[PDB]
Design a protein around this nucleic acid. Structure first.
Ligand SMILES: Nc1ncnc2c1ncn2[C@@H]1O[C@H](COP(=O)(O)OP(=O)(O)NP(=O)(O)O)[C@@H](O)[C@H]1O
Ligand SMILES: Nc1ncnc2c1ncn2[C@@H]1O[C@H](COP(=O)(O)OP(=O)(O)NP(=O)(O)O)[C@@H](O)[C@H]1O
Ligand SMILES: Nc1ncnc2c1ncn2[C@@H]1O[C@H](COP(=O)(O)OP(=O)(O)NP(=O)(O)O)[C@@H](O)[C@H]1O
Ligand SMILES: [Mg+2]
Ligand SMILES: [Mg+2]
Ligand SMILES: [Mg+2]
Lengths: 315, 315, 315
DNA sequence: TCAGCCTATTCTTTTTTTTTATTCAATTA
DNA sequence: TAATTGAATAAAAGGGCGACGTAGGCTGA
């Protein structure tokens, strides 16, 4: 967590340093690793001083070629905030990945609001219990924010009641353009304090409910690539873990029985380029559920069980 | 629940208040739930005036991140009206909740419309007697409005019939779009008098008879999702309770394995992610039927038992 | 009961108003009962003028939001035709509520084709003796229409059957699509003269023979669903008691018990959800038949003995 | 011409078919 | 003297088994 108070040097004034705050660029990681075509069209920053803010951002955080052994250390330095389920820690090799896109499939009753509200108390746990010891936030868009589920699974982990009440924040995401106004604000709390998890269970559901296909046909598409350009900028900012429940379409293959999958879910191929690690969830018998990793040479294809019981997502 | 009679501040002219009204969004809650580019496509609106509506309405309603010890109270203000027999109410922890989506689905003669008529008398009850002291809004397309039942359950709770008849009102949608034609009625009446409940007793029955051509996103699915976000909108506009009713299909693929008669009710995944909770209907013996809850994030998957008696639901 | 001549105003063209009548829409309620896109799909129509109908269909008939009091005045304004038997009316609490689908399924020889003969006679009475005093319709797809049987009921009620033979009009179906076509001719007759009873006394006897099952079933069921939409709209325009005779299969599994003999009325769910007053017909001893009630919004699960005499239904 | 025709290459590896209701202490003497 | 049940059973295996079609679109036209 680093603000842009470092970026006040080399002839810069106090007026222009606020014009990076009001543009949405609240971190020093936002300045160097952004493409140049979005930074230059702001009214009131000239071309020579725009080349001044990129050259001071180059030497602090390096964009040059770094050793591949440092990348393997960048692969293993993940905190791996565990889901509470030890089978998934044997499936995803020790929990969720902080800073990589981790997508979970779901249609109905598969525990999607139950997995998000067990992880939302996990962010206070120490690193031996798996959690990252940090604040977090659950932004909901389907009107399914639960205090009772949040308060009960804290008793499973044995914490108090009032500390997790000061934990995960919530705002109702009304619109697809309201996904952006929280995102500039969610980086602004990242200036205020450290955060370790961000969860939205129905981010793609707003895409299902704003753009009446077709006629807009690209407007439903580029707003997904927009939203998947913002969150990876926060994922490259600190290394925050992302947890998104994505919905699934029932593909019509129902003649007869050969590879009959009501599948190939929504979001398109442009989330498929961004989802380096995908998961499939589905109903089993009773209330027990099953996870399988998809669309990932990073994680091996296997299956395990996570059981939504009265205590939480456990066994 | 606030109207646009207060937005007429800081240069907003009188033309854009009432043309926003008739076009479909009567409340400033709906303006925050309206998108950016959708406001531009109304004839009589420019792009510069489209900023002056959404930004100035953002001065009215706040959308910041609020901590988890405040929605615990925001859920606690829910009136959570009763269901007429406490075995369902203890299954539902008091009864159905306001500001959510609740669904009853079952085969036939199972009381999909009879659980409506007992909820239709609840809205004029006091808060000690479950009711939010308001009015309910009954919509049905099949023709299951039988107001002699509404005389009956008012005598179940003692109160007179005429004042109840001055209350809850009716509409019958003949078309899929005719639902959204009569949907504007909601807000319209809503701001004139506080309503406790909305009933659409045939959500997807009209959609069952107007498919796309072969199953596709058109009127069968997209206009269904256009419908449900407005049902989401009314849940977020006023917090008014609403019950929804989906018909049921059979399964022709499941040869005589574990259960020879499974159902999987219609609508696919678009209804399912808009679905907050469901309660499955199936008959027992005679007047005894059975409610089984489906897909609640806050309540377990338990089962209860009611009976359609002459006074209404009972035991 | 208002035709397209009540629509021919306001500079609306005379070339499209016959295209409605070519598409079966002979009255302004039907286009008000029709969704927007399908009328746009009609060839040779102006799209805006089609919308100009859709605001003037909204003007001519009440599609506006009303309160249950005037409904309860208008729902009391139903002719409520008696069924010839004294015991059957008090079972149904005053006979057959006009404007509704009342289904009568049973085995062979129970009286399904018998009662539909007697109902066509008792329409011609004045309303004091539970008559309707209107024309009535007979759609047969079995050939079991027998006008000699009507004259026996005519002598029972002191009415000259020669006068009753100038009314009820015969028709005969042969196909699935010859059936649904026969509504569109009949709709006109409903404009040009008052009716009370449109019987389809083997309405689902024909869909079983002309579609196999497990494949070509969805082509049956959707087309069965396309049938009832035209059928419910005939009830609501002209105020006509709609009587459907369903046949019945025998269910074949370990559900074989007594007094249910498990029958499972054919037509799945789409013939079930379109019930207002679903019946059931068992044979007792001899001519004493036993009419159990299913699936009705206002009636209890009772039964009433009735004997099919030499002169119609008797007691 | 489209509409009937033609069946272009594909492509990736693993999940769950019952029950007549006694034990006991009984839920009441 | 309470006495009927709130509770609980399983390794064998049935009076059971069957789906639309727009996707490469030649030739007839
Ligand atoms: N009090 C409770 N006790 C036990 N289990 C519970 C309780 N409340 C909820 N559950 C479980 O929560 C599960 C709900 O799964 P879930 O997939 O989160 O539903 P959902 O996500 O809210 N539906 P949706 O809004 O469409 O995402 C149920 O299957 C229950 O087993
Ligand atoms: N006076 C009454 N006494 C007892 N039961 C009644 C009485 N009136 C109606 N019922 C029952 O109420 C139920 C009404 O049917 P219901 O199941 O609500 O409609 P439904 O599920 O929508 N089927 P459908 O109306 O065709 O779509 C039936 O089970 C009737 O037996
Ligand atoms: N003149 C009569 N006197 C007495 N009973 C009669 C007379 N004519 C017919 N019936 C009875 O009417 C009943 C006809 O049964 P009904 O159920 O109407 O026919 P149905 O079953 O529909 N024929 P089907 O199409 O094969 O089902 C029989 O039980 C006859 O005994
Ligand atoms: Mg869930
Ligand atoms: Mg019902
Ligand atoms: Mg008969």
């Amino acid at each position: 967590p680093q603000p842009i108070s470092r970026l006040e040097q080399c002839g810069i004034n106090a007026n222009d340093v606020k014009k990076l705050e009001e543009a949405g660029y609240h971190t020093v990681e936002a300045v160097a690793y952004a493409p140049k075509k979005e930074l230059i069209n702001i009214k009131g920053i000239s071309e020579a001083k725009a080349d001044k803010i990129l050259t001071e951002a180059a030497k602090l955080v390096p964009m040059g070629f770094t050793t591949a052994t440092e990348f393997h250390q960048r692969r293993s330095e993940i905190i791996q905030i565990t889901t509470g389920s030890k089978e998934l820690d044997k499936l995803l090799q020790g929990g969720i990945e902080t800073g990589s896109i981790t997508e979970m499939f779901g249609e109905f009753r598969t525990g999607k609001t139950q997995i998000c509200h067990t992880l939302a108390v996990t962010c206070q746990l120490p690193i031996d219990r798996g959690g990252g010891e940090g604040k977090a936030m659950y932004i909901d868009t389907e009107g399914t924010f639960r205090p009772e589920r949040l308060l009960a699974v804290a008793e499973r982990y044995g914490l108090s009641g009032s500390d997790v009440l000061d934990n995960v924040a919530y705002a109702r995401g009304f619109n697809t353009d309201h996904q952006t106004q929280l995102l500039y604000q969610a980086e602004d709390m990242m200036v205020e304090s450290r955060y370790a998890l961000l969860i939205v269970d129905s981010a793609t559901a707003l895409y299902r409910t704003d753009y009446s296909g077709r006629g807009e046909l690209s407007a439903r598409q580029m707003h997904l690539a927009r939203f998947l350009r913002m969150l990876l900028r926060l994922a490259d900012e600190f290394g925050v873990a992302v947890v998104i429940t994505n919905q699934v379409v029932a593909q019509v293959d129902g003649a007869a029985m050969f590879a009959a999958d009501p599948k190939k879910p929504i979001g398109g191929n442009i989330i498929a380029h961004a989802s380096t690690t995908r998961l499939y969830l589905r109903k089993g018998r009773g209330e027990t559920r099953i996870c399988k990793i998809y669309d990932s040479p990073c994680l091996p294809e296997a299956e395990a069980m996570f059981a939504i019981n009265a205590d939480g997502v456990g066994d």
